[PDB]
Amino acid sequence: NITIFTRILDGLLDGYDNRLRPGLGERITQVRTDMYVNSFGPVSDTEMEYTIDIFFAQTWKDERLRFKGPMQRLPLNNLLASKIWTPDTFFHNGKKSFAHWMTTPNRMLRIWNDGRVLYTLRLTISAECPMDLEDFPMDEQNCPLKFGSYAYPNSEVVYVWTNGSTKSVVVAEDGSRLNQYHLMGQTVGTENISTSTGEYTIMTAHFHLKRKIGYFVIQTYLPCIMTVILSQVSFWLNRESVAARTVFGVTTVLTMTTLSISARNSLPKVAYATAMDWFIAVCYAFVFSALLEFAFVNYITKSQPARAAKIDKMSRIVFPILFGTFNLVYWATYLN
Amino acid sequence: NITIFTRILDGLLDGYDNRLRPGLGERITQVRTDMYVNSFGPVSDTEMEYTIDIFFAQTWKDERLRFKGPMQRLPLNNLLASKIWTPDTFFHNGKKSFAHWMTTPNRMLRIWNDGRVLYTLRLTISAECPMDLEDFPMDEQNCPLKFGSYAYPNSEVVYVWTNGSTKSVVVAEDGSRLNQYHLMGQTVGTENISTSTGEYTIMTAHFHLKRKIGYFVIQTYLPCIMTVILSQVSFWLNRESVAARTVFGVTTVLTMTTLSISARNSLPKVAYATAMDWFIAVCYAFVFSALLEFAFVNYITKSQPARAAKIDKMSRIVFPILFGTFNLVYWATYLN
Amino acid sequence: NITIFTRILDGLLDGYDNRLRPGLGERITQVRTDMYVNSFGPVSDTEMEYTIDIFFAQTWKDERLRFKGPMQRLPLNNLLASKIWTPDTFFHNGKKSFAHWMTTPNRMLRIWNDGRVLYTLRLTISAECPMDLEDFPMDEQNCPLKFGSYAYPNSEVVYVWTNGSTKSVVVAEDGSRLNQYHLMGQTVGTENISTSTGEYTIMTAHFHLKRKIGYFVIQTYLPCIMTVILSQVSFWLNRESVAARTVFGVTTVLTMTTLSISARNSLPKVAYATAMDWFIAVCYAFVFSALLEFAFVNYITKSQPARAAKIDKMSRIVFPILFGTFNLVYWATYLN
Amino acid sequence: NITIFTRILDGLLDGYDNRLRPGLGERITQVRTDMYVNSFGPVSDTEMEYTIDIFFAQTWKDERLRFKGPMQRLPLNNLLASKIWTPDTFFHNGKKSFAHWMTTPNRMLRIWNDGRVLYTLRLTISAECPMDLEDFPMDEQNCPLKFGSYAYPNSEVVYVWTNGSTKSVVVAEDGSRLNQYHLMGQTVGTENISTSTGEYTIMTAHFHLKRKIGYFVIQTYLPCIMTVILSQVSFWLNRESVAARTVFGVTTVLTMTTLSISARNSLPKVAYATAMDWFIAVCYAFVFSALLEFAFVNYITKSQPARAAKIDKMSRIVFPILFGTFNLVYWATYLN
Amino acid sequence: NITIFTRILDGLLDGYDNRLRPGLGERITQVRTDMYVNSFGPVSDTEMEYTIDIFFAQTWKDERLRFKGPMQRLPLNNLLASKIWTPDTFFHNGKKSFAHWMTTPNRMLRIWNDGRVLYTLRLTISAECPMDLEDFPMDEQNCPLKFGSYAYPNSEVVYVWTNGSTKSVVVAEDGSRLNQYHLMGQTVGTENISTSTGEYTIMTAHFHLKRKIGYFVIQTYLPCIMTVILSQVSFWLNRESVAARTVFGVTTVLTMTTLSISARNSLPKVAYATAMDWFIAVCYAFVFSALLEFAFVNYITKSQPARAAKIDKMSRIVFPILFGTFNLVYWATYLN
Numbered sequence A, B, C, D, E: 001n002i003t004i005f006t007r008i009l010d011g012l013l014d015g016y017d018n019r020l021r022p023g024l025g026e027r028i029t030q031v032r033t034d035m036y037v038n039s040f041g042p043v044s045d046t047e048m049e050y051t052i053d054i055f056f057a058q059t060w061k062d063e064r065l066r067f068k069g070p071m072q073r074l075p076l077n078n079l080l081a082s083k084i085w086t087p088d089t090f091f092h093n094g095k096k097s098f099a100h101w102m103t104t105p106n107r108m109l110r111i112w113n114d115g116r117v118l119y120t121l122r123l124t125i126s127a128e129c130p131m132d133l134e135d136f137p138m139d140e141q142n143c144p145l146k147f148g149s150y151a152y153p154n155s156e157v158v159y160v161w162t163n164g165s166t167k168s169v170v171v172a173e174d175g176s177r178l179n180q181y182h183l184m185g186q187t188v189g190t191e192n193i194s195t196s197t198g199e200y201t202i203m204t205a206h207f208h209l210k211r212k213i214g215y216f217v218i219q220t221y222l223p224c225i226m227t228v229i230l231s232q233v234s235f236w237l238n239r240e241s242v243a244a245r246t247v248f249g250v251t252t253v254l255t256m257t258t259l260s261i262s263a264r265n266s267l268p269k270v271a272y273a274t275a276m277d278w279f280i281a282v283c284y285a286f287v288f289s290a291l292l293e294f295a296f297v298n299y300i301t302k303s304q305p306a307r308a309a310k311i312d313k314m315s316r317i318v319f320p321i322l323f324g325t326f327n328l329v330y331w332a333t334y335l336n
């Protein structure tokens, strides 16, 4: 009962043209789309791109492939995929999208008596996600994913999500493979765009990203905090030890300078000030200000020692208090 | 006696459709799989991927290729591989899998009178291995390898290991080419998954990895240990040498700070504290604490020299003892 | 009413040769071109290349595809693109240009009764943009984009912009994805070139680029400015503290030296002096000159203390004034 | 006299099946192989791979292509290469081997009356060469190159070198393009391997590599030697200059620490001690030991100055002598 | 008058075999070659490769494509390129050569009544240029470019430049895109090579390269010069300031050491001494020698102060003079 299937396949192909869409000149082709994200890949800030692997599924109705037989379903493989007409779907923001070939071309194609068709297609999309690094690292990003049609305007092909929007897009629980982000949720929608040729249908999915802090705390914030504390120790050393206090001030200032260079090496070369830069700038003033206090004190330690000694003791208390007060404002404002 | 073989090949192809599986509508196709890992490639922690080269072998029974002749075996090459039906096997976790082309496409195909078939296929799979770096570097990882079918549910195609599981997967003795891991052993199993289309068969193989220590000992642990010892030398210097003791404390603190930055450059940017980070943090306190002791001593060396001198001598003994005691707890706990 | 279209397509292909241009031996083929830049990619100074993604559109008239039927337009896909003749357009400066393949080959083809044709083609061009880094970073660049024909001289194929030049090239408002440049505007034009074979038509588009400053201010300029200020603090320290003033001078000089090396690491290895190099050179003299003043003062502080003390006080005022005066000339000259 | 050749080619192809080896069921096919290495590419220690470009030549006898005519030789190109049967040769250790395509596919094929055939094939093999870095950099490596057959066991296809082994493999005098190795010589041999399918023939070629020293001398050895000499200068400074001697000891110790980190950055992350590591470890003790001597001397310079002064003078002589004595043992042992 | 051309093309292909060269068994095919270098790409010292883009043109006479008609020329495209016989030209030293595909395959093909043919082919060749870095950076290099035939010996195919050698190779004025080299000129020639198969014709073109200095002056030479000057300032400081002079000597020595490591990071790991290395070695002695002078002076400043003071003053003059004298010899010898 196998040769019976062979005759059915041969008959449908004969008299069938793959260069023409179903319902041409009679109606408008309607396509139902569903998605399942297997893994959300890493996000590269420098390249403003993210990698995503999905099992894209599409469905459309064709009246030219109707048949009757013992079975109502015809499981198949990539061999027959190119023999019939399929939509020229593309991703608008996809810089470079490539499919999978080995071990076998990941494709499927099924047909039913009523003309319903199914066409799954594994993909690996390296899309582009622009990001505004104004509140970095306390920033939230919305990386989109837009897919539609190239040569078929809305008057011919229209894409609509199957069933409700809740089940339209599915993300695996373990599919979040981000080392510096949290996948809060997803949103979907539809819209139209206008060009010279005509209107087109756009299906859009947005992923809400919440960055996870903790890597920069151990990398930039803590060294800056400890460096500031190191300089303040000089305030507890007697003035006559000019050389000893000089070493503390000079080393700390250079240490802060090199940290700023190192921090931005991996960060994108954005031409504006981020939140982290302001924190380093404030820490720079504290260490720099302490050095000035020593120089001013050392210059009047002879004529009027009383004022110099009074300032030194006062500095021990004022400086730590201001640093602690500033931190609460900085963290509370951003974490609220 | 060569043209006799030519007629046999031509006859089988005629009347044979490669788009339909054997036993369609009559039974369920059964596939027997065996593997031989030639080389386990390097594991990239940053990319969470590992490279593996295997000689994948598959076997299935087809009743449409039966023949009789002088020979019961028909050795062949890649030429006839695409002329018949082969399963659309794929790797679920394979990010990007590509076969080999030169010098000649590495493929084979053999047939027997009873319909038994053999299809070997060399492969180079760059799979993805998620890892939890909580006990790093004293961590054990289990990198999996899942392969199955794309368009053929369990009702049609089922994969089962040939013979026992012991001989199902073979790893060469010299095939372990890991510079920072040990290949302890392997495990295999089977499971099913459910999706919209239907149930599918999953064949899984797990590799147990035990990291080898010794690279980080010479890179991070030892410099931290020697840096701590350097600071303690200051306790054996007289107080009046304020400048000399200042150099020891400042240089050591900055040395520890830069080591932390350097260590995590190669390590993945995990947003949580590893075991190595805690060790560096403890070493940071020791050098930092020593600097505080000098500052406190230098501030009361005049009013009450007796207490300052007593503290200095006590510090020489307490500090080394605590560092030695802590090391035993750290190493014993992780190495046990 | 679908099979009617099938007959039309078959008839046109028969008797139609794709190896010959329309109007061969009768007239000169005329092509109308329009462009829409979806995104202007990043500019790599080291590689002197920039990436651009466009939706290139072309139009030409052919008398061999005329037909009459219910519809005056025949939307199609990549299937029929290769079946007919299309110009062998190429980019002269394109080092490596590749099209898009997945999810479907991004191409379109439409025909009309009068013979008018449309052929859109998505592209990603990695062109080369030579740049003269003489006023870097205060520099303006004009990256061109030249496209024409390879084997068809001007006597056969001529390219002309459609409608006016204003609408010939369109750039999306959000298509400017440059992190270190501003897209001021665009210009277009036409020209001819002469070679051994004959004359050819050239269509050129130029993009005016204005670099955005602010990344180098936080990276190179500010550390140099703060480093100079650090050295001048030594002028407020008494001469007897020889060791203390030595630390300031030595550390600052080495700090400037390493900044110069770090700055040019990312910058292209141009064999001539840039504007930034001169700024660093001036800052080098200030810190170096201060060290010389201390050495000269320390060498005559005994024989004639009066002159040494007078010079030290004068240095406190002259040095800051000159640095401030120089900055106004440097910034005003370049920013004007 | 050109059409005469055309008839000969057409006749041979008709009735000739490329899917069957010559002498099938009658004898065992014998293949003669010769090689000419155009250039031995660079060896990447990190990737344990080396690149080699060769002009591989193969020869086998087929009785199905016999002909008679004016010429006994038929020079041809890649066009006819795929029309006949060729062995499915492959490289066992080749991770990723690709041929050359432009300007024209580099292939050749010649036939003679007796059935002798020639098939040259340019190749670029990126093989894998495991190396044991125990005597690094005084190490000798033997990178192999194994090639055989995939689907044809020894009972069907056997590879044997043509003529003697001396002329079997040829390496160009200028083909050695190694910047850190010397190509001492080559060796060849044959062996069999056993698998599930059956026995296979293996043809192996080994290249003997002798590393050239001189890059590491200027990079690691000399800085370590000069750093040790710098510390010993402190022994010629009076004890009262506590600060001056402190700077020498601290700077040298940190300098050695950073050199160890820098040296292993390029070197593979081997989890065992190399010869170079031991040399750095010995140098670490010398500088570290000198610092301890100063601390111990400074702690008893008051109670018993005589012993402290005596030790200081003795250290000036003992330390340099031991360093010189150790170097002779280290270099002589490895260079002998 | 278009169908007339169609008949001509069809007739020529019929009865024409592309697997046989023209004049087979009657004469020797002669090929005329001309080149036009559009852009000389960057030269990578580490990889010993350079990229070049050319418009290669070839010409040969075939008597099997003669025709008569209204036009004596048949402009065409890549469609007919593969339908006829073309030489299997290849580049001997080309590691990896690839052609251009988009927007259209860059190829052309023209035919004339007498049988003359033209075949242009755009190319991007990543050739290999061995270089001897003995006088680096004052070195001159001659990167060659060899092209010939693979399967056609001299007895069948011979390559000869068209017209004179002056016009044989053309380089655009703006085609020199080298950031660290000057394109002085070009030379061409012919030669034969002998192998097992037979003699072959070689066409060679050499490009003379003169490196441009100025990048290394700002990177390595100047920091070394300024570092030496910094150390000499210590000679103008009184002996009693032991700590101050110690800082100058130690910092300068370490600064020179790190510069040597940094300089060779980008430079190829050549296992022999370059000219730049000797310059750094001389600078190393000057700073190192100054430190020794201070140590020796400080050790005898009590017993015989007169000799120590006399040496210190003499050092101020001798050391600067020797450094200036050495520079003239170094620069004059290499720049002459």
Ligand SMILES: CN1C(=O)CN=C(c2ccccc2)c2cc(Cl)ccc21
Pocket (backbone or CB within 6 Å): A092, A093, A149, A150, A151, A193, A194, A195, A196, A200, C036, C038, C055
């Ligand atoms: C609005 N618009 C145009 O006018 C150019 N044509 C298109 C287009 C072309 C084919 C199909 C859909 C859309 C296009 C594509 C993008 Cl990704 C952004 C804007 C845009």
Ligand SMILES: CN1C(=O)CN=C(c2ccccc2)c2cc(Cl)ccc21
Pocket (backbone or CB within 6 Å): A036, A038, A055, B092, B093, B149, B150, B151, B193, B194, B195, B196, B200
């Ligand atoms: C359970 N599931 C789905 O629902 C989506 N479809 C599939 C699938 C699709 C085709 C064959 C097998 C499985 C799939 C694939 C992975 Cl890798 C993980 C989950 C998953």
Ligand SMILES: CN1C(=O)CN=C(c2ccccc2)c2cc(Cl)ccc21
Pocket (backbone or CB within 6 Å): C092, C093, C149, C150, C151, C193, C194, C195, C196, C200, E036, E038, E055
């Ligand atoms: C003027 N010229 C030549 O003489 C070589 N031929 C060409 C050419 C070849 C085919 C089509 C167009 C132009 C060419 C191409 C460039 Cl990109 C620059 C200069 C140049």
Ligand SMILES: CN1C(=O)CN=C(c2ccccc2)c2cc(Cl)ccc21
Pocket (backbone or CB within 6 Å): B036, B038, B055, D092, D093, D149, D150, D151, D193, D194, D195, D196, D200
């Ligand atoms: C001994 N062996 C096997 O059992 C697996 N099959 C093979 C094989 C498969 C086809 C041809 C030759 C050999 C093989 C290949 C290597 Cl590279 C190493 C061991 C090994």
Ligand SMILES: CN1C(=O)CN=C(c2ccccc2)c2cc(Cl)ccc21
Pocket (backbone or CB within 6 Å): D036, D038, D055, E092, E093, E149, E150, E151, E193, E194, E195, E196, E200
């Ligand atoms: C002299 N020689 C040989 O003997 C090996 N065969 C060849 C060859 C093979 C085919 C065509 C031309 C030349 C060859 C190629 C090079 Cl690139 C260098 C040396 C060499």
Ligand SMILES: *[C@@H]1O[C@H](CO)[C@@H](O)[C@H](O)[C@H]1NC(C)=O
Pocket (backbone or CB within 6 Å): A154, A190, A191, A192
């Ligand atoms: C998009 O076009 C379709 C055409 O049927 C229309 O129904 C729909 O309302 C449009 N959507 C928007 C947002 O304009």
Ligand SMILES: *[C@@H]1O[C@H](CO)[C@@H](O)[C@H](O)[C@H]1NC(C)=O
Pocket (backbone or CB within 6 Å): B154, B190, B191, B192
């Ligand atoms: C998987 O499906 C097969 C269907 O025959 C069944 O026999 C087997 O028990 C299932 N395995 C599991 C783990 O459910």
Ligand SMILES: *[C@@H]1O[C@H](CO)[C@@H](O)[C@H](O)[C@H]1NC(C)=O
Pocket (backbone or CB within 6 Å): C154, C190, C191, C192
């Ligand atoms: C280019 O060639 C065309 C040929 O028709 C001519 O009309 C045009 O004036 C030429 N342009 C220039 C700038 O020479």
Ligand SMILES: *[C@@H]1O[C@H](CO)[C@@H](O)[C@H](O)[C@H]1NC(C)=O
Pocket (backbone or CB within 6 Å): D154, D190, D191, D192
């Ligand atoms: C390999 O197999 C062949 C089979 O003919 C045999 O002659 C040869 O001795 C074998 N070599 C070894 C090393 O066993």
Ligand SMILES: *[C@@H]1O[C@H](CO)[C@@H](O)[C@H](O)[C@H]1NC(C)=O
Pocket (backbone or CB within 6 Å): E154, E190, E191, E192
């Ligand atoms: C190369 O071979 C040709 C064969 O005709 C000969 O004429 C020519 O002189 C040879 N050139 C050299 C340099 O030997």
